Amino acid sequence: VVKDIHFEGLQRVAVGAALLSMPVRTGDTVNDEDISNTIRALFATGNFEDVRVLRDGDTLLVQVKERPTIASITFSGNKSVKDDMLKQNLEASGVRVGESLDRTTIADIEKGLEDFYYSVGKYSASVKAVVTPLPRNRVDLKLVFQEGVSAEIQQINIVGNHAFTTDELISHFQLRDEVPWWNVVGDRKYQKQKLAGDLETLRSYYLDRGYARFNIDSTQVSLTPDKKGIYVTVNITEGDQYKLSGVEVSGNLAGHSAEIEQLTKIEPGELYNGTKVTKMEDDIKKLLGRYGYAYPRVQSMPEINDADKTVKLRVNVDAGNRFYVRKIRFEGNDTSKDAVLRREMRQMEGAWLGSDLVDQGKERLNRLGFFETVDTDTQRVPGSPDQVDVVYKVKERNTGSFNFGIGYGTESGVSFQAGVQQDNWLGTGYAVGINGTKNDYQTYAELSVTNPYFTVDGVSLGGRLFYNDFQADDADLSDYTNKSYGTDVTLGFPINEYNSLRAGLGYVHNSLSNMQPQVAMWRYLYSMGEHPSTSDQDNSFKTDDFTFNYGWTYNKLDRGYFPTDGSRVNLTGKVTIPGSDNEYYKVTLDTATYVPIDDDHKWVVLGRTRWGYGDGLGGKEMPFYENFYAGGSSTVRGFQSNTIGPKAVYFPHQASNYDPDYDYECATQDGAKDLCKSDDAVGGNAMAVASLEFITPTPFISDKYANSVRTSFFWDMGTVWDTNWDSSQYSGYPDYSDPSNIRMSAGIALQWMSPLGPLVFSYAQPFKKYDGDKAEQFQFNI
Amino acid sequence: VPDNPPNEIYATAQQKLQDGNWRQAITQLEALDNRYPFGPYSQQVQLDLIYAYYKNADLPLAQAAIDRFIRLNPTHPNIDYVMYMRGLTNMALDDSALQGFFGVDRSDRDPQHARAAFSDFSKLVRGYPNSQYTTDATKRLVFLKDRLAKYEYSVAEYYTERGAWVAVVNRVEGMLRDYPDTQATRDALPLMENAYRQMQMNAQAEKVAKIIAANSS
Amino acid sequence: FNSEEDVVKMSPLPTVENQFTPTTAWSTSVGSGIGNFYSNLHPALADNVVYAADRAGLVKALNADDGKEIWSVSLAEKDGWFSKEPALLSGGVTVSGGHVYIGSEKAQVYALNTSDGTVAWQTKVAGEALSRPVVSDGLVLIHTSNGQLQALNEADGAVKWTVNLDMPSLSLRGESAPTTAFGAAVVGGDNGRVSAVLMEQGQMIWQQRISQATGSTEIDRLSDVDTTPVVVNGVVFALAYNGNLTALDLRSGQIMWKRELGSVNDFIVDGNRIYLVDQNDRVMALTIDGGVTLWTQSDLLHRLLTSPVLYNGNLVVGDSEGYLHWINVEDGRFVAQQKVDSSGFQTEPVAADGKLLIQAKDGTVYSITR
Amino acid sequence: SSDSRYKRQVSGDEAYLEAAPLAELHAPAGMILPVTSGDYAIPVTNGSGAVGKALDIRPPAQPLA
Amino acid sequence: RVVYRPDINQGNYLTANDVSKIRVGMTQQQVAYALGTPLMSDPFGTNTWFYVFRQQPGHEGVTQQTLTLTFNSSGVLTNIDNKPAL
């Protein structure tokens, strides 16, 4: 009878816990079978065994030394996989890292890692682990594993085809047979998933071309495991071209058989088509989904009859029950009135589910953006054959422009420019943008508040305000004093289910004092008839504009801020109604059409084109303060802001109410006293900027993010020109009346919109040889 | 990450906790967690770590850690405290934002966290009605049920705005059945009144009229 | 991105002493074209004639007389589904009489008869033929890597003896031309099955195998091999797909015993002496005593190819980077002296009639003679 | 995490003790409704402890070994 | 004024045959099997089932057909009132 048992060197499990753990204890007669029980209990655990059981008398010394605890954290050798991903494929697999590490598991997990590398598509021949024990019970493992990288090492082959070339069938594959990189469309890397995709694609190709009897094909992925031999051979057997002749429908539904039949009507002599029959299935599914049966069972069976090559298409459709939705739950919108997310839905709780309707809902949420996640999970309630709960999982992330400007001036104090453009204002669904700039002599205030919802229907109420005290002055005067009081309210209703029509009023008050020397401004003055001077700056011009402001917009973007498969058109037109101190007629049109080349939408071609044509009404010219600009924005990279376009030339003046001396060169007293060819951006009344960007996450940027970086390589052509121009006043100077000032500029734009701080790199080389331009090869927007 | 003795490192950790250097405190508490997953001090450090997560407002980490603790050791005198912070953490996920600090424009964002908090606090109060946290949990629950009722009132308001009358009636049904207690439900019942009257369900509308007239003073 | 391999690089060539200076490198070419595609083509020597081929559909009948071209044929059709139909010939090349059997991984076996004209008959075997077709007293054996082992009658092609071996998931590039012996063709498979087909109706006499290969128990990715059992005196030496050397002492039927000694690429046997190369790429020599090794060697580990052939006490080895390591006056002498190409080798060297021949990954045949 | 603040506070505002008291709806003659069908109900048998942020929200002590 | 609006649908889709099939005495389980699980129920008072089919398109008219059914303590359909079209 063992009576006193002492355990030492446990350090991971208490003495009492161990004492209760082993099936033997005090107070019982420990015999040979009990010793065997202790030893086998040490053996069978499978976590640690160390048997030192000495019983000399009534003292049982059980000495077990614990390899625990160890933390293997050191992954040294990654070059193509991330240690986070390795730890995932350890943990989520079911081999999570709380480690005891018996001696076997060393080599076992070495082999396990090598097996993981076998899985990803490459080879790893060497994995060396070093043990590092620190003496409490703690150890850490040094894994140095050596890479043998290989992803596409193919030579594809298809043996058995006699109606198609090898190359034609290999083209469509998601695997490629060792082809250059400028062939790539999306992702290529060889996985068993890729192979299954290829096999299914080949089957689809035959079943579409009309080879019905083919579903029979063996696959062999032979391997020179010198990391370079992966020969895929898919030995198949074609049938014969098969003629489709007639369809029968076994229909179990409250009656639509007319519509179903007219949808499934196959003209005589057609060839059997796998994708055509699949689209027949899906169109029956939607022809039911509209009317409600959002979980029908549709089975299409082809009946093959040989010796005449006949296929009979027999589809049996049975519908479930009719009207489902019980609750429409959004979960995830922690920072946004769901009243927003619910105004969006075109599928309304308490009605009959329509799968296309909740698809419209998901797309509409996306086209508002302000967040990014696909889901329209329709999980059905427990306990009823009806009643599905439409649950979206949005994932809010805040769009908001917080633009900080500090300094910098020397003779001018520290400036303060705050640009906060918040859309879908994280309080609500409103959009407020404030560009408030006090730069030591410039007071430019812009407030823009717009309700996308002002009734239930969708009318949008948007007001804008600009208080522009633009002086850019030297001392107190004779420096283009300009005041702009700008109010405008835009009531804009969506009526074409994707087309908004906006109508608004606008008051623009323009006060112009101490005119600068530009012939363009005096041409406008002559146009208005207010006879000016020509060598004195004592010019005053108070005007008020009552502009009717009509806009139009088409928006179809399969995403929000990073469109794919989309095309938005934006027309904006100011027409000044009679009854104002000024007249003009301006029309702008933007078009951003993203078209994707890849199916995976990691490659996209952006095409954005904007026209602008402004001209004054009969007897007037369009006032210069609305002449378009270009460049230095998301218009034309490769220029300083608002530089592209006609340059206004100066008239001489040697007295302008004390024309300041030693200032304002180009035909002043201190500079040249006679005529000056003057370069400065005044903007023209016509604009055309067309740009194409290539949206490409290159293999040099780590793609764990598809929502926070877009990398563009862009070619852009921009022109700004006057249309009311002449050579009777500009004869010796360059003439600006023809579109020929095309700037071509190409550049890289890395756009990292993690909500609050972008490093928007835009390096642009502008190369289209024209004179008077002003360029810049670094743009970091905000 | 020093290699001090346990007593010294725990003492410094506690002192920094009373001070309020919560990020640093989380660092050395996590170190003391790794260096032993054993010891009575290990349990004390797990609790201290959940406290530190809650205070530093690392709420996903706090929720994960508290669930791990309640899974690992499900009987303990402090399971009250465990469940209480899980409820409080769901609460803080509900009420943490710029507008949730402004005090304006809330009570109908995502309620999922509020629902989870209510379930947890209900489990707490029902499991241990004789405890220090009990009355505060009761206050939690009354406020939280009021918040849920406001959420479903807000959704009912939106549907009555758009015209979705049957959605209105179902949502106010949900409010009456699940909790006819808070102010929001008494506010809501005229929504049924108007909804039934709009869909011309006359006897039903008169019935809800009787209930609202009797209930209001 | 696909090339950062810190794997062991090729060991450098040892000292260059050698008693025999290669006195001839007679060369011929087509400018094609094996490339780096792993395949088993090689010239065959029939009556001082060198029937060479290469993966374009080009067959250049050469003769060992300084080698002018004869009978240069292009095997590719222009009718049907494409013009000139770019084919592949990862094919066996073998000769019986004037009958040149070539088998190509477009699922074709062409037989070109330079005997009474050009009798070029194409048999469409299942799968893609990859092993050197074997002539066996009225049969050509084709171990096509669909696990299938076709057997065809000469002069017309006639499918029969259509055995169906077992293939694993990786369905490897295991070529295994069945060796014919006493009316039994011993064919390796892609899983370890060393099946003997004693042609009665295509009857395999085997219920057992090598339990190790690539596909069920993957090993160090170096088990690339060209697998061919060899019959001598009534014993079949098999070195099947992954390294497990097996002796099969046929006593009125298949009788087995596995004296394991792995690391297999291909081998030659002379009476009581075995000369093979390893997957580790070292030239182990074996004596039939249970397999007590001689000639452990290390100088050439991880040369992408190394494949042996013997003549006149001098063991030849064709390796990558266009060398020919020669083994000789048997150890202690191991060194090598030859470099015939900067193109390289991937294919078998053939010794016959006292003439040694070597295909090259580009450039047709490079006969190297003492 | 602090600026000499936030020792007896929760992130954001608190309205714990400013909740509207619960008040069961009176039922007219025969118009009963299921007072619950779910988990949203509170036991009344409770109290009184340290309501509001005046309780030891810090980890409670226990003997060390 | 807005020129055009959405089209709103609210629950209990019916047809002429759908409303016609049922008759007095059929148990509510079979009633549900026939029409569908009604999602507008009166909670307080009698076990009555309201069937509402509501549709408002593009500013014109109204489509409101209501089929009211009254089951009793055991659950037996009686006293059916159909009001089509408002």
Three-state SS letters, A363-426:
HHHHHHCCECCCCCEEEECCCCCCCEEEEECCCECCCEEEEEEECCCCCCCCCEEEEEEECCCC
Structure tokens at C113: 């008869």
Q: How far apart are the C-alpha atoms of A392 and A360, rounded to whole Å? A: 13
Minimal C-alpha gap between E82 and chain D (Å): 24
Is the four-CA dihedral A370, A373, A377, A381 of positive or negative sign? Answer: negative
Structure tokens at A696: 């490409």
Closest CA in chain D for residue B23: D1
If you write DSSP's letter for every residue of A455-494 in order, what string do you get?
SSS--EEEEEEEEEEE---SSSSSS-EEEEEEEEEEEEEE
Q: How far apart are the C-alpha atoms of C156 and C154, rounded to whole Å? A: 6
CB B148 within 8 A of CB B111: yes
CB B66 within 8 A of CB B36: no
- Please calculate the CA angle A717-A723-A724 and round it to the nearest 5 degrees: 155
Question: Which of C6, C108, C219 to probe by mutation at the A interface, max A CB count within 10 Å?
Answer: C6
Structure tokens at C112: 């070109």
Q: How far apart are the C-alpha atoms of A761 and A781, rounded to whole Å? A: 8
Structure tokens at A551: 């806009």
Structure tokens at A249: 């429908």
**How many other C-beta atoms are found inside a 10 Å radius of the C-beta of residue A288?**
24
Q: Give the CB-side neighbour count of residue C64, counting CA atoms within 13 A.
A: 23
User: With an 8 Å Cβ cutoff, is E44 touching chain D?
Assistant: yes
If you write DSSP's letter for every residue of C63-90 in order, what string do you get?
ETTT--EEEEEE----STTSSS------
| CATH number, domain containing residue A620 | 2.40.160.50
Three-state secondary structure call for residue C300: coil
Minimal C-alpha gap between E85 and chain B (Å): 11
Amino acid, single-letter form, for residue A151 = A
Q: Phi-psi category of A326—alpha, beta or left, where left has phi over 0 and alpha has psi -120 to 50?
A: alpha
A→B interface, C-beta within 8 Å = 11-12, 69, 71, 136, 138, 326-327, 330-339, 342-343, 348-351, 426-428, 456
Q: How far apart are the C-alpha atoms of A492 and A489, rounded to whole Å? A: 10
User: With an 8 Å Cβ cutoff, is A221 touching chain C?
Assistant: yes
Name the method of structure determination: cryo-EM
Range of the domain at A497: 400-781
Closest CA in chain A for residue C220: A125
Q: How far apart are the C-alpha atoms of A70 and A47, rounded to whole Å? A: 13
Amino acid, single-letter form, for residue A125 = A
Three-state secondary structure call for residue A317: strand
**How many other C-beta atoms are found inside a 10 Å radius of the C-beta of residue A365?**
25
The torsion angles phi and psi of A519, rounded to 5 degrees, stand at: -60, -25
CB A253 within 8 A of CB A293: yes
Q: Phi-psi category of C2—alpha, beta or left, where left has phi over 0 and alpha has psi -120 to 50?
A: alpha
Q: How far apart are the C-alpha atoms of A529 and C54, rounded to whole Å? A: 90
CB < 8 Å to D31, chain E: 44-45
Range of the domain at B19: 1-217
Q: How far apart are the C-alpha atoms of A558 and A567, rounded to whole Å? A: 9
Task: Show Cβ contacts of residue A40 under 8 Å, excluding neighbours closer than 6 positions.
Answer: none
Nearest Cα neighbor of A517 from A655, A631, A354 is A655
Q: Give the CB-side neighbour count of residue C199, counting CA atoms within 13 A.
A: 23
CB A740 within 8 A of CB A686: no
CB C112 within 8 A of CB C102: yes
CB C247 within 8 A of CB C262: no
Closest CA in chain D for residue B147: D19
Maximum pairwise Cα distance, chain C? 60
- Residue that is written with structure tokens 């009604």 in the block: E38
Tell me which residue in D12, D40, D41 faces B95 most closely, judged by beta carbons. D12
Q: Residue A207: in which H helix or E strand, if any?
A: helix A192-209
SS (HEC) of C224-259? CCCCCCEEECCEEEECCCCCCCEEEECCCCCCEECC
Q: How far apart are the C-alpha atoms of C343 and C366, rounded to whole Å? A: 12
The torsion angles phi and psi of C332, rounded to 5 degrees, stand at: -85, 25
- Structurally, chain B folds into a number of domains equal to 1
The torsion angles phi and psi of B50, rounded to 5 degrees, stand at: -65, -40
Q: How far apart are the C-alpha atoms of D18 and B139, rounded to whole Å? A: 9
Structure tokens at A43: 């053996």
b (16+ CB within 10 A) / e for C10-40: eeebeeeeeeeebeeeebbbbebbbeebbbb
Structure tokens at A765: 């080389």
Q: How far apart are the C-alpha atoms of A472 and C102, rounded to whole Å? A: 88
Tell me which residue in A346, A455, A459 faces E6 most closely, judged by beta carbons. A346
CB A237 within 8 A of CB A208: no
Tell me which residue in D2, D11, D39 faces B96 most closely, judged by beta carbons. D11
Tell me which residue in B95, B139, B177 faces D34 most closely, judged by beta carbons. B177
- Residue that is written with structure tokens 């929502």 in the block: A707
Task: Show Cβ contacts of residue D1 under 8 Å, excluding neighbours closer than 6 positions.
Answer: B20, B21, B22, B23, B55, B56, B57
Tally C-beta pairs within 8 A across A and C: 101
Strand order in the sheet with C160-164: C134-135, C140-142, C148-152, C160-164
CB D19 within 8 A of CB B139: yes
* C315-322 contacts, C-beta under 8 A, 24 or more apart: C315/C275, C315/C283, C316/C349, C316/C351, C316/C356, C317/C277, C317/C283, C318/C345, C318/C347, C318/C348, C318/C349, C318/C358, C319/C345, C320/C10, C320/C344, C320/C345, C320/C346, C321/C10, C322/C360
The torsion angles phi and psi of B114, rounded to 5 degrees, stand at: -65, -40
Strand order in the sheet with C323-327: C306-311, C314-319, C323-327
Minimal C-alpha gap between C303 and chain A (Å): 11
Nearest Cα neighbor of C132 from C164, C88, C102 is C102
Q: Are strands A431-439 and A442-451 parallel, antiparallel or unpaired?
A: antiparallel
CB < 8 Å to A352, chain E: 9, 11, 13
Q: How far apart are the C-alpha atoms of B152 and B159, rounded to whole Å? A: 11
Measured in Å, how far apart are chain C's first and last C-alpha atoms? 45
CB A558 within 8 A of CB A593: no
Range of the domain at C180: 1-370
Structure tokens at A586: 């301006």
Q: Note whether A touches D: 3 CB pairs or more under 8 A.
A: no
The residues that bridge with C95 in the sheet, in sequence order, are C100
User: With an 8 Å Cβ cutoff, is E40 touching chain A?
Assistant: yes
Minimal C-alpha gap between B29 and chain D (Å): 13
- Residue that is written with structure tokens 């049969």 in the block: C139
CB C237 within 8 A of CB C250: no
E→B interface, C-beta within 8 Å = 8, 10-11, 39-45, 50, 52, 54, 56, 64, 66, 86
Q: Residue A681 gets which letter from DSSP? A: B
CB A101 within 8 A of CB A133: no
Nearest Cα neighbor of D19 from B146, B138, B137, B154 is B146
Q: How far apart are the C-alpha atoms of A272 and C66, rounded to whole Å? A: 60
- Segments in chain B forming alpha helices (H): 6-19, 22-35, 40-56, 59-72, 79-95, 99-102, 112-127, 134-162, 165-178, 183-198, 202-215
**How many other C-beta atoms are found inside a 10 Å radius of the C-beta of residue C340?**
18
Q: Angle B134-162/B79-95 helices, nearest 10 degrees?
A: 30
Task: Show Cβ contacts of residue E78 under 8 Å, excluding neighbours closer than 6 positions.
Answer: E24, E25, E70, E71, E72
Closest CA in chain E for residue A456: E5
Strand order in the sheet with A328-330: A328-330, A388-392, A377-380
Is the four-CA dihedral A716, A717, A723, A725 of positive or negative sign? Answer: positive
Structure tokens at A212: 């019905």
Q: How far apart are the C-alpha atoms of C347 and C40, rounded to whole Å? A: 6
The residues that bridge with A302 in the sheet, in sequence order, are A313
Minimal C-alpha gap between C333 and chain A (Å): 30
CATH topology of domain E9-86: Beta-lactamase Inhibitory Protein; Chain:B, domain 1 (3.30.1450)
Cα pseudo-dihedral E33, E35, E41, E47, rounded to 10: -60
Three-state secondary structure call for residue A501: strand
Minimal C-alpha gap between A147 and chain C (Å): 6
Task: Show Cβ contacts of residue A673 under 8 Å, excluding neighbours closer than 6 positions.
Answer: A652, A654, A667
Q: Residue A547 gets which letter from DSSP? A: E
Q: Phi-psi category of A667—alpha, beta or left, where left has phi over 0 and alpha has psi -120 to 50?
A: left
Task: Show Cβ contacts of residue C91 under 8 Å, excluding neighbours closer than 6 positions.
Answer: C39, C40, C41, C53, C55, C102, C103, C104, C105, C129, C130
- Please, which residues 693-732 of chain A have a Cβ atom closer than 8 Å to chain C? 699
Q: How far apart are the C-alpha atoms of A546 and A486, rounded to whole Å? A: 10
CB A400 within 8 A of CB A421: yes
Three-state secondary structure call for residue A69: coil
Q: How far apart are the C-alpha atoms of A638 and C94, rounded to whole Å? A: 68
Q: Are strands C108-113 and A243-252 parallel, antiparallel or unpaired?
A: unpaired
Q: Give the CB-side neighbour count of residue A751, counting CA atoms within 13 A.
A: 17
Q: How far apart are the C-alpha atoms of B96 and B57, rounded to whole Å? A: 9
Measured in Å, how far apart are chain E's first and last C-alpha atoms? 25
The torsion angles phi and psi of C28, rounded to 5 degrees, stand at: -145, 160
Helices (H) and strands (E) counted in chain C, each on its own, are 0, 31
* Contacts of C among chains (3+ CB pairs under 8 A): A
A348/B159 Cβ within 8 A: yes
Task: Show Cβ contacts of residue A221 under 8 Å, excluding neighbours closer than 6 positions.
Answer: A195, A230, A231, A232, A233, C169, C170, C171
Extract the runs of DSSP E, i.e. beta strands, from A147-242. 217-224, 229-236
Q: How far apart are the C-alpha atoms of A385 and A319, rounded to whole Å? A: 12
Nearest Cα neighbor of C314 from C298, C286, C337, C297 is C337
* C118-126 contacts, C-beta under 8 A, 24 or more apart: C118/C73, C119/C155, C120/C73, C120/C75, C121/C155, C121/C156, C121/C157, C122/C157, C123/C152, C123/C157, C123/C159, C125/C150, C125/C152, C125/C159, C126/A235, C126/C150
- Residue that is written with structure tokens 């009979």 in the block: A312
Q: How far apart are the C-alpha atoms of A80 and A84, rounded to whole Å? A: 12
Q: Give the CB-side neighbour count of residue C213, counting CA atoms within 13 A.
A: 26
B163/E56 Cβ within 8 A: yes
- Residue that is written with structure tokens 């094609």 in the block: C32
A459/E2 Cβ within 8 A: yes
Minimal C-alpha gap between A132 and chain B (Å): 15
**How many other C-beta atoms are found inside a 10 Å radius of the C-beta of residue E77?**
19
* B123-129 contacts, C-beta under 8 A, 24 or more apart: B123/B83, B124/B80, B124/B83, B124/B84, B124/B87, B125/D42, B125/D43, B125/D46, B126/D43, B127/B83, B128/B79, B128/B80, B129/D43, B129/D45, B129/D46
Tell me which residue in E42, E43, E64 faces B199 most closely, judged by beta carbons. E64
The torsion angles phi and psi of A625, rounded to 5 degrees, stand at: -70, -10
D30/E45 Cβ within 8 A: yes
Structure tokens at C49: 């004639």
Nearest Cα neighbor of E49 from E79, E14, E84, E6 is E79
Q: Phi-psi category of B211—alpha, beta or left, where left has phi over 0 and alpha has psi -120 to 50?
A: alpha
Q: How far apart are the C-alpha atoms of D5 and A71, rounded to whole Å? A: 38
Is the four-CA dihedral C269, C361, C226, A145 of positive or negative sign? Answer: positive
CB A720 within 8 A of CB A687: yes
